Design a protein around this ligand. Sequence first.
Ligand SMILES: C=CC(=O)N1CC[C@H](n2nc(C#Cc3cc(OC)cc(OC)c3)c3c(N)ncnc32)C1
Length: 277
Amino acid sequence: ELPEDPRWELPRDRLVLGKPLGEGQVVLAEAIGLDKDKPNRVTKVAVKMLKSDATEKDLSDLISEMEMMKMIGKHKNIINLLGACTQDGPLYVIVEYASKGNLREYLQARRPPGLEYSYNPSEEQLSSKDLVSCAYQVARGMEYLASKKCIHRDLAARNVLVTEDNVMKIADFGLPVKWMAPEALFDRIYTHQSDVWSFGVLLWEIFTLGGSPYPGVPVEELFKLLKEGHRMDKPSNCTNELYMMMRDCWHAVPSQRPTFKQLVEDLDRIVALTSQE
Ligand SMILES: C=CC(=O)N1CC[C@H](n2nc(C#Cc3cc(OC)cc(OC)c3)c3c(N)ncnc32)C1
């Protein structure tokens, strides 16, 4: 029995459940009067709830996700908590809707069709500057979360969502081996520094327009290969400077990786110098 929290509570009648977005389960919905000072406006939102066949660990995880989202607060580049329906029936956690889906899918749909190398499984191509701008927005979100002492633990382009206005939003930050820092694979030590590693894999995903990391490398081998100083090759269409940044994020010594603060400052600069092509 969840306790009431009138900071977040939305009467269930104010919510109109629409179509599934993916499977907890997430469904599109329309929310009437989220804003106290605009009670006759409807907003599109995503609603996370348990599946039919759920347990009581699945519930306690859903509740802890919600509680962490209330603590972390709002930022443009994270999926923000908007509300909750907790009392009059099954738990609904209401969050921002991102109409263009996850980043992996978004980039894939925008591949040039003629690349035998990486087919388009589906939109307008992304310029060089737009791709860098994507990386910058993800780094800003992660900079905010780290400032709030949140360790993501599964940062990847599949865990970034894209809004109607092409805003990148970190998802699932309040709750796979190919994104994990060596020290996370082995010693299960998760830090802001391991999140930086994951961000490097995510940069690589960006500049390969949603490629699969370590292609053809069996998971079983990966720790050994990384300990021996194996890193992914530069993506064909990536500048040497952005590759340097990737490689820095993949420093073996965690203390030697850049912070999200530095990454944001470096990407801010790169975006401004990046072109038309
Ligand atoms: C990996 C992709 C994936 O699962 N997708 C892509 C579309 C779909 N989806 N999944 C979505 C979600 C979600 C979500 C739900 C949450 O509930 C607590 C928390 C969270 O991160 C803070 C994100 C979502 C959304 N917010 N807006 C639009 N589409 C959404 C499911």
